[PDB]
A paper describes a structure:
In previous work, we have introduced pAF into lactococcal multidrug resistance regulator ([name]), a small homodimeric protein harbouring a pore that exhibits promiscuous substrate binding capabilities, either by direct incorporation using the dedicated orthogonal translation system (OTS),19 or, preferably, by introduction of p-azidophenylalanine (pAzF), followed by a post-translational Staudinger reduction. Incorporation of aY into protein scaffold [name] gave rise to an artificial Friedel–Crafts (FC) alkylase exhibiting complementary enantioselectivity to a previous FC-alkylase design using p-aminophenylalanine as catalytic residue in the same protein. X-ray crystal structures of the parent and evolved designer enzymes suggest that the introduced mutations cause a narrowing of the active site and a reorientation of the catalytic –NH2 group. Position V15 resides inside the pore of [name], and is the same position of ncAA incorporation as used in earlier works featuring pAF as catalytic residue.
In a following round of evolution, SSM libraries of two additional positions in the neighbourhood of the ncAA, i.e. M8 and N19, were prepared using [name]_RNY as template (S8†). Several variants from both SSM libraries performed better than the parent, of which mutant [name]_RNY_N19W ([name]) showed the largest improvements, giving 98% yield and 93% ee when used as purified protein. Remarkably, while [name] exhibits the characteristic [name] structure, forming an open pore at its dimeric interface of similar shape and dimensions as observed in other [name] structures, the [name]_[name]_KK structure appears to be more closed and exhibits a narrowed cavity. Furthermore, a significant difference in the rotameric state of the aY side chain is observed (S11†). In contrast, in the evolved variant it is placed closer to the pore centre, directed more towards the central tryptophans. The narrowing of the dimeric interface in the evolved variant can be directly linked to the [name] mutations, which enhance side chain packing between the α1 and α4 helices. The enhanced packing is stabilized through a combination of hydrophobic interactions, aromatic stacking, and hydrogen bonds. Notably, L18R forms hydrogen bonds with M89N, N88 and N14 in the evolved variant, which may explain the epistatic effect observed in catalysis when the L18R and M89N mutations were combined. Hence, this suggests that the RN mutations are key to forming the observed narrowed dimeric interfaces that appear to be beneficial in FC-alkylations, while the introduced Y and W residues most likely further fine-tune the structure and the interactions responsible for achieving efficient and enantioselective catalysis. Moreover, the close proximity of D100 to the aY residue suggests a potential interaction between the carboxylic residue and the substrates, similar to what has been proposed for V15pAF_RGN.
Residue numbers in the entry:
A (entry chain A): 1 to 112
B (entry chain B): 4 to 110
Amino acid sequence: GAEIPKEMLRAQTNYILRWVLKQGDNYVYGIIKQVKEASNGEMELNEATLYTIFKRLEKDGIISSYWGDESQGGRRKYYRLTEIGHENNRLYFESWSRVDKIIENLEANKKS
Amino acid sequence: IPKEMLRAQTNYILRWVLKQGDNYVYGIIKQVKEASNGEMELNEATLYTIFKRLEKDGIISSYWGDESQGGRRKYYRLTEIGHENNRLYFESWSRVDKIIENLEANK
Protein backbone atom coordinates (compact mmCIF):
# COMPACT_ATOMS: atom_id res chain seq x y z
CA GLY A 1 0.00 0.00 0.00
CA ALA A 2 2.49 2.54 -1.27
CA GLU A 3 1.06 4.89 -3.91
CA ILE A 4 2.88 5.55 -7.18
CA PRO A 5 4.99 8.72 -6.85
CA LYS A 6 4.09 12.31 -7.72
CA GLU A 7 7.32 12.48 -9.75
CA MET A 8 6.11 9.67 -12.04
CA LEU A 9 2.71 11.34 -12.66
CA ARG A 10 4.55 14.50 -13.56
CA ALA A 11 6.92 12.59 -15.88
CA GLN A 12 4.00 11.01 -17.73
CA THR A 13 2.27 14.37 -18.15
CA ASN A 14 5.61 15.85 -19.31
CA TYR A 15 5.95 13.06 -21.91
CA ILE A 16 2.45 13.64 -23.31
CA LEU A 17 2.78 17.41 -23.47
CA ARG A 18 6.19 17.17 -25.12
CA TRP A 19 4.79 14.76 -27.68
CA VAL A 20 2.03 17.24 -28.50
CA LEU A 21 4.50 20.15 -28.70
CA LYS A 22 6.61 18.05 -31.11
CA GLN A 23 3.64 18.07 -33.53
CA GLY A 24 3.80 21.87 -33.98
CA ASP A 25 2.47 25.28 -32.89
CA ASN A 26 -0.74 25.18 -30.89
CA TYR A 27 -2.91 27.19 -28.56
CA VAL A 28 -3.01 26.10 -24.96
CA TYR A 29 -6.63 24.92 -24.88
CA GLY A 30 -6.00 23.19 -28.20
CA ILE A 31 -3.33 21.09 -26.52
CA ILE A 32 -5.48 20.47 -23.44
CA LYS A 33 -8.54 19.46 -25.46
CA GLN A 34 -6.53 17.01 -27.55
CA VAL A 35 -4.98 15.45 -24.45
CA LYS A 36 -8.30 15.18 -22.63
CA GLU A 37 -10.00 13.51 -25.59
CA ALA A 38 -7.13 11.03 -25.98
CA SER A 39 -6.87 10.44 -22.21
CA ASN A 40 -10.58 9.76 -21.56
CA GLY A 41 -10.88 6.24 -20.13
CA GLU A 42 -7.06 5.81 -19.85
CA MET A 43 -5.88 8.45 -17.38
CA GLU A 44 -7.43 11.34 -15.47
CA LEU A 45 -5.47 14.39 -16.66
CA ASN A 46 -4.40 16.53 -13.71
CA GLU A 47 -4.87 19.99 -15.19
CA ALA A 48 -2.76 21.49 -12.39
CA THR A 49 0.16 19.18 -13.18
CA LEU A 50 -0.13 20.05 -16.86
CA TYR A 51 -0.27 23.77 -16.08
CA THR A 52 2.79 23.53 -13.81
CA ILE A 53 4.82 21.83 -16.53
CA PHE A 54 3.68 24.36 -19.17
CA LYS A 55 4.74 27.27 -17.02
CA ARG A 56 8.09 25.67 -16.17
CA LEU A 57 8.87 25.08 -19.86
CA GLU A 58 8.03 28.71 -20.60
CA LYS A 59 10.19 30.01 -17.71
CA ASP A 60 13.02 27.78 -18.94
CA GLY A 61 12.81 29.21 -22.46
CA ILE A 62 11.79 25.82 -24.00
CA ILE A 63 8.48 27.23 -25.22
CA SER A 64 7.53 30.82 -26.09
CA SER A 65 4.09 32.37 -26.46
CA TYR A 66 2.59 34.59 -29.14
CA TRP A 67 -0.80 36.02 -30.04
CA GLY A 68 -2.76 34.80 -33.08
CA ASP A 69 -3.55 38.43 -33.91
CA GLU A 70 -2.85 41.95 -32.67
CA SER A 71 -6.31 43.00 -31.36
CA GLN A 72 -6.30 42.94 -27.50
CA GLY A 73 -9.14 41.03 -25.87
CA GLY A 74 -10.47 37.51 -26.50
CA ARG A 75 -7.31 36.03 -28.02
CA ARG A 76 -5.99 32.50 -27.80
CA LYS A 77 -2.43 32.19 -26.54
CA TYR A 78 -0.24 30.11 -28.83
CA TYR A 79 3.00 28.38 -27.98
CA ARG A 80 5.87 27.05 -29.98
CA LEU A 81 9.14 25.32 -29.16
CA THR A 82 12.03 27.75 -29.24
CA GLU A 83 15.45 27.17 -30.73
CA ILE A 84 16.72 25.68 -27.45
CA GLY A 85 13.38 24.00 -26.75
CA HIS A 86 13.47 22.09 -30.01
CA GLU A 87 16.94 20.90 -29.05
CA ASN A 88 15.74 19.96 -25.56
CA ASN A 89 12.74 18.09 -26.94
CA ARG A 90 14.80 16.20 -29.48
CA LEU A 91 17.18 15.13 -26.71
CA TYR A 92 14.22 14.12 -24.55
CA PHE A 93 12.77 11.77 -27.19
CA GLU A 94 16.16 10.46 -28.24
CA SER A 95 17.07 9.63 -24.62
CA TRP A 96 13.77 7.81 -24.13
CA SER A 97 14.40 5.94 -27.39
CA ARG A 98 17.72 4.76 -25.96
CA VAL A 99 15.87 3.55 -22.85
CA ASP A 100 13.31 1.72 -24.98
CA LYS A 101 16.09 -0.10 -26.80
CA ILE A 102 17.83 -1.05 -23.57
CA ILE A 103 14.58 -2.52 -22.22
CA GLU A 104 14.08 -4.47 -25.43
CA ASN A 105 17.66 -5.75 -25.10
CA LEU A 106 17.15 -6.66 -21.44
CA GLU A 107 13.94 -8.52 -22.36
CA ALA A 108 15.86 -10.43 -25.05
CA ASN A 109 18.74 -11.25 -22.66
CA LYS A 110 16.26 -12.50 -20.05
CA LYS A 111 14.55 -14.75 -22.60
CA SER A 112 17.87 -16.29 -23.75
CA ILE B 1 24.12 15.30 -24.54
CA PRO B 2 23.61 15.84 -20.75
CA LYS B 3 25.80 14.03 -18.23
CA GLU B 4 22.98 12.05 -16.56
CA MET B 5 19.81 10.30 -17.64
CA LEU B 6 16.57 11.83 -16.32
CA ARG B 7 15.52 10.47 -12.95
CA ALA B 8 12.36 9.09 -14.53
CA GLN B 9 14.50 7.11 -17.00
CA THR B 10 16.74 5.70 -14.30
CA ASN B 11 13.67 4.78 -12.24
CA TYR B 12 12.05 3.02 -15.23
CA ILE B 13 15.16 0.91 -15.90
CA LEU B 14 15.73 0.11 -12.21
CA ARG B 15 12.13 -0.96 -11.73
CA TRP B 16 12.32 -3.18 -14.85
CA VAL B 17 15.48 -4.84 -13.59
CA LEU B 18 14.09 -5.41 -10.06
CA LYS B 19 10.90 -6.86 -11.50
CA GLN B 20 13.13 -9.69 -12.72
CA GLY B 21 14.37 -10.47 -9.19
CA ASP B 22 16.73 -9.51 -6.43
CA ASN B 23 19.89 -7.64 -7.40
CA TYR B 24 22.77 -5.53 -6.14
CA VAL B 25 23.89 -2.14 -7.40
CA TYR B 26 27.01 -3.20 -9.33
CA GLY B 27 25.05 -6.07 -10.85
CA ILE B 28 22.30 -3.75 -12.06
CA ILE B 29 24.86 -1.33 -13.52
CA LYS B 30 26.67 -4.19 -15.27
CA GLN B 31 23.49 -5.67 -16.74
CA VAL B 32 22.35 -2.30 -18.09
CA LYS B 33 25.82 -1.54 -19.42
CA GLU B 34 25.75 -4.90 -21.23
CA ALA B 35 22.22 -4.35 -22.59
CA SER B 36 23.28 -0.93 -23.93
CA ASN B 37 26.42 -2.26 -25.69
CA GLY B 38 28.56 -0.45 -23.12
CA GLU B 39 26.93 2.94 -23.78
CA MET B 40 24.77 3.51 -20.66
CA GLU B 41 26.44 3.53 -17.26
CA LEU B 42 23.78 4.19 -14.65
CA ASN B 43 24.84 6.39 -11.73
CA GLU B 44 25.56 4.31 -8.62
CA ALA B 45 24.76 7.19 -6.29
CA THR B 46 21.41 7.71 -7.99
CA LEU B 47 20.59 4.01 -7.60
CA TYR B 48 21.39 4.15 -3.84
CA THR B 49 19.22 7.26 -3.59
CA ILE B 50 16.30 5.56 -5.31
CA PHE B 51 16.63 2.48 -3.16
CA LYS B 52 16.59 4.56 0.04
CA ARG B 53 13.39 6.31 -1.09
CA LEU B 54 11.71 3.01 -2.03
CA GLU B 55 12.82 1.31 1.19
CA LYS B 56 11.26 4.18 3.15
CA ASP B 57 7.79 3.18 1.92
CA GLY B 58 8.34 -0.57 2.08
CA ILE B 59 8.52 -1.02 -1.75
CA ILE B 60 12.07 -2.42 -1.53
CA SER B 61 13.78 -4.45 1.21
CA SER B 62 17.44 -5.34 1.48
CA TYR B 63 19.71 -8.04 2.84
CA TRP B 64 23.31 -9.25 2.75
CA GLY B 65 23.58 -11.89 0.07
CA ASP B 66 25.29 -15.26 0.02
CA GLU B 67 29.06 -14.96 0.13
CA SER B 68 30.87 -14.90 -3.17
CA GLN B 69 34.68 -14.76 -3.43
CA GLY B 70 35.25 -13.70 0.17
CA GLY B 71 32.40 -11.24 0.75
CA ARG B 72 28.74 -10.38 0.58
CA ARG B 73 26.88 -7.86 -1.51
CA LYS B 74 23.88 -5.82 -0.42
CA TYR B 75 20.89 -7.14 -2.35
CA TYR B 76 17.66 -5.26 -2.88
CA ARG B 77 14.31 -6.85 -3.74
CA LEU B 78 10.77 -5.71 -4.40
CA THR B 79 8.45 -6.67 -1.59
CA GLU B 80 4.90 -7.84 -2.20
CA ILE B 81 3.59 -4.30 -1.80
CA GLY B 82 6.54 -3.22 -3.96
CA HIS B 83 5.47 -5.51 -6.83
CA GLU B 84 2.01 -3.94 -6.46
CA ASN B 85 3.50 -0.46 -6.72
CA ASN B 86 5.64 -1.63 -9.67
CA ARG B 87 2.61 -3.05 -11.47
CA LEU B 88 0.75 0.24 -11.07
CA TYR B 89 3.86 2.14 -12.24
CA PHE B 90 4.14 0.07 -15.44
CA GLU B 91 0.37 0.15 -15.97
CA SER B 92 0.35 3.94 -15.83
CA TRP B 93 3.13 4.14 -18.42
CA SER B 94 1.24 1.63 -20.60
CA ARG B 95 -1.69 4.06 -20.45
CA VAL B 96 0.60 6.85 -21.70
CA ASP B 97 1.41 4.66 -24.70
CA LYS B 98 -2.32 4.21 -25.36
CA ILE B 99 -2.87 7.95 -25.10
CA ILE B 100 -0.15 8.53 -27.67
CA GLU B 101 -1.70 5.94 -29.97
CA ASN B 102 -5.01 7.82 -29.60
CA LEU B 103 -3.36 11.15 -30.41
CA GLU B 104 -1.62 9.58 -33.46
CA ALA B 105 -4.92 8.12 -34.73
CA ASN B 106 -6.93 11.17 -33.76
CA LYS B 107 -9.42 8.94 -31.90
